[PDB]
Ligand binder design. Sequence first.
Ligand SMILES: Nc1ncnc2c1ncn2[C@@H]1O[C@H](COP(=O)(O)OP(=O)(O)CP(=O)(O)O)[C@@H](O)[C@H]1O
Ligand SMILES: CC(=O)C1=C(O)N2[C@H](C1=O)[C@H]1c3c[nH]c4cccc(c34)C[C@H]1C2(C)C
Ligand SMILES: [K+]
Ligand SMILES: [Mg+2]
Ligand SMILES: [Mn+2]
Ligand SMILES: [Mn+2]
Length: 994
Amino acid sequence: MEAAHSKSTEECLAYFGVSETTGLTPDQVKRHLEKYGHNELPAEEGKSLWELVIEQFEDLLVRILLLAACISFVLAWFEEGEETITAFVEPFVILLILIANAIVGVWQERNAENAIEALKEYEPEMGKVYRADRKSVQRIKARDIVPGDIVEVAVGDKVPADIRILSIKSTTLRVDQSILTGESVSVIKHTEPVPDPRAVNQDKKNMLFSGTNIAAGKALGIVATTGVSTEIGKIRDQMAATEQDKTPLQQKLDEFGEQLSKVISLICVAVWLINIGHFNDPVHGGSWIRGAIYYFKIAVALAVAAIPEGLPAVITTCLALGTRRMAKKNAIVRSLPSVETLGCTSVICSDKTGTLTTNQMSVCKMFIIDKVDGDFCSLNEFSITGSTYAPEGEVLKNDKPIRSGQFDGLVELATICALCNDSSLDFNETKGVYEKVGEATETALTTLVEKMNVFNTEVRNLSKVERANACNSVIRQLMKKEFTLEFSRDRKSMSVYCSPAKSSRAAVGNKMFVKGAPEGVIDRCNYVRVGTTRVPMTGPVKEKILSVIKEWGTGRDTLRCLALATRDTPPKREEMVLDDSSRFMEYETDLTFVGVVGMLDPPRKEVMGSIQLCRDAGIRVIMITGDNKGTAIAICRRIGIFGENEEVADRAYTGREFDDLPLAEQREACRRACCFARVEPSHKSKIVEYLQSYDEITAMTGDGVNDAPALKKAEIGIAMGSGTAVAKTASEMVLADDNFSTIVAAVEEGRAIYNNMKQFIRYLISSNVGEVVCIFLTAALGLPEALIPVQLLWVNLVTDGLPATALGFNPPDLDIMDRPPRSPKEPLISGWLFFRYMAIGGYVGAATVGAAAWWFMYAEDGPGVTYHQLTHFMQCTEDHPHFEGLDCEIFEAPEPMTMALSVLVTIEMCNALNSLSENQSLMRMPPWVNIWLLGSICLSMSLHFLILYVDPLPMIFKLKALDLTQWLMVLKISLPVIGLDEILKFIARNYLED
Ligand SMILES: Nc1ncnc2c1ncn2[C@@H]1O[C@H](COP(=O)(O)OP(=O)(O)CP(=O)(O)O)[C@@H](O)[C@H]1O
Ligand SMILES: CC(=O)C1=C(O)N2[C@H](C1=O)[C@H]1c3c[nH]c4cccc(c34)C[C@H]1C2(C)C
Ligand SMILES: [K+]
Ligand SMILES: [Mg+2]
Ligand SMILES: [Mn+2]
Ligand SMILES: [Mn+2]
């Protein structure tokens, strides 16, 4: 059944053809269960660890290193009776890396807790119905409720389905709809049509929404919809639309996967063309068994050389450490990549209530009457400080603290606030904070009474649990509450009838204390309290008081105001009927106006300063709230999203006003406007989606179930520590201490992290370039491979491993938070920078083949000088007469490859220093800046020396140690890589773009 809110109750009943005092028949229920299905949300799984690891071995690039694992496996199985001892280390070191990178890949991408399961917390197991087969209510499984059911809800119930209210049995039905609005103040419901077809949930005052709850009262309704066709079901579906997105760089990674996987395929057929180059002269002395095996040997060496294994490890380590830093600021990152994603953020969308604000309703202004001089009427206004339910703050007069008990009118105001009240305050010993018990707007009065302390009660030595209601209890000892005239919609006030406690002295006679909406309470006042005296309420006085109250309700203030009054001479108890709320208004007449309190849900102290720092970093903040527009704008002004006098006609929209714009204008509104109010959970994700469609990297901050869709949709969702479990499980990061400042800190950390990542990725990839150049040089020319996979794997994983991780510890810049966010489209290399280490890469790729082949010809030991014969080792077994004065095995010596490896290691270690900075020469930026880079290289070097000098190590890696002349040759053939890039820095800091 659609449009339940605009149908009358008779139309809803007639739709299902049911009586309100009968309900559906059990057969009808059976048919509706068939037709509509059960009243429940589908569970959303999320793949076993099985189908996750499987997906790690799916993206193209990973297969390349699996191909070179299986080929490596075969070309190590059918190994001759020679070294089948360690031939299997290669297909295992590889096969190990692919295992390690998978387990890590899942340990960062997997979201443990499920947000749809948290949502189901709002699904009550049980609901209550009237069905035709019984007169009395029937308590059944909620999932068995169907459209058409007559349902009964009552105080404390979770609402089981979307329900048109038919009949309110209590005097009011008060509903907490925070899961759809973020707002915890009760909604007073009625049963009349809401004619607007586009009514937003905050308008549907005749509906009950599944998953909300009844703060008070009792009602009967008819179920309009169940299952996913409900408001909470819509939230569930937007969370189920699981896009499983990815960090900008993580999309660059996924991108570079496609990049490198083709580069290899092209290079492999390119090696093949130069392998097929001397295919026209193989003299068939070794058939093709040698040829088709030497070629795969090359492929495994090329694939290994191209793929920068260890990169997944250095990143994960960088991210993980980042997460450790944020944890010390009380930011719990639940997804590793997210710690960095925040750095690229250009727009931060924010819930207001409980996010920007404390979600703790606070009386911040009050007044009583000081004097009435005929027509003129002087008010005594006070402000009250403090922004939580904690009874901490003071009452101020002209910004100076005063003792509330000084003023008789405040004693009376406090008395009414304490007594005309169904709530209290409680100190939660487990959470360490004060919490309301009952309605927010009532607990605000309770908190006020505690701050006012009109009797100067000693409260400093109380435990926090006792302190919670101390000053209210002292008022209870004076006046005894005898009964309550509860709130009704017709009069918009409530009152309590009180007698002075035994042993009076206070004052003789019974009293009625009244609070309510200003206009109706004031209309029923014939007198005004001035101190302890009472004077006639006149027109001009009534007008002055109403005017000030109206200013308080619409200002830069926009406060909820209550008027407080007492009936000085109440009827005798016996003259009042309590079972009929229609009579209550009349009982609350001939009142004496006492005062007014104005409350709001106020900003967290750090929010204003945080918005400013965001603004200084080129980040826009947009408030997106379920709350009304007036309040939303007023808070925006207090927190500096808008200027205090800024005109916001086209900068602030309700969800409806936003919906009314042409689709094009809706997109532009999202760039111009900074406050969206009276919004549904869908509006928030819609706005985030528009923002993202300008390619803005966008964040969402929230605490509520109604923020869950936007939290999921945003690149980065951020939840408040004290907010809902649903919002937390929908987020990438949680601010455990609710400190909004931490977001600003997380952006800086994320920018620092991004800078270090991009450059340690360059450092690690400049390496993989030279290797490929090498594995191609010593292949095309017909040379004995200067490096083989098992050595390359050590370098990429370990030798370059440490230094890369060292660069992820470089100091962040000083202006890091004074630049605008970087563009998401920004590559990782551009023009100058690409050819920059294609030059450095052209050097390592040559100097390695160049120092290995050096050991042949122009070196001492030194088989050696063969020249053109070196580029023809395939015919030493066959065409031996050519190779006279030499053996036919010394072409497979460990020394020349040790020369090659020692060059690579030495070049990359130097290449780590020039990686400390992008443009600043080592002259102007010392190599002693990042000490941890020094310890990192000295480790890599001492590890290099190791595999050269430990009995097993050089056999598994095919190395043989170098003389001190074999190292002088290495240094004089590697160290120039510094001066090369160093001059590449001089030709970039001046004549390029500096
Ligand atoms: N328990 C209570 N005792 C006294 N006064 C109460 C009260 N609960 C609410 N009120 C007062 O009466 C008014 C009744 O609220 P109501 O149901 O009219 O909603 P609202 O006017 O705040 C709704 P909306 O923002 O959706 O238009 C409140 O604004 C408040 O001043
Ligand atoms: C088994 C497993 O999950 C993985 C791997 O085994 N790896 C990475 C990877 O994710 C591979 C990868 C994909 N996209 C990129 C971009 C840059 C670098 C890497 C990758 C390293 C790749 C490899 C093969 C080490
Ligand atoms: K998200
Ligand atoms: Mg909220
Ligand atoms: Mn992977
Ligand atoms: Mn109302």
